[PDB]
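Title: [Solved] neurotensin 3D structure

Original question kept below for reference.
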Amino acid sequence: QLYENKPRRPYIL
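Solution (posted by the thread starter after getting help):
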């Protein structure tokens, strides 16, 4: 994999 997309959740429940 060349471009790593790291995920982010906006609401912390």
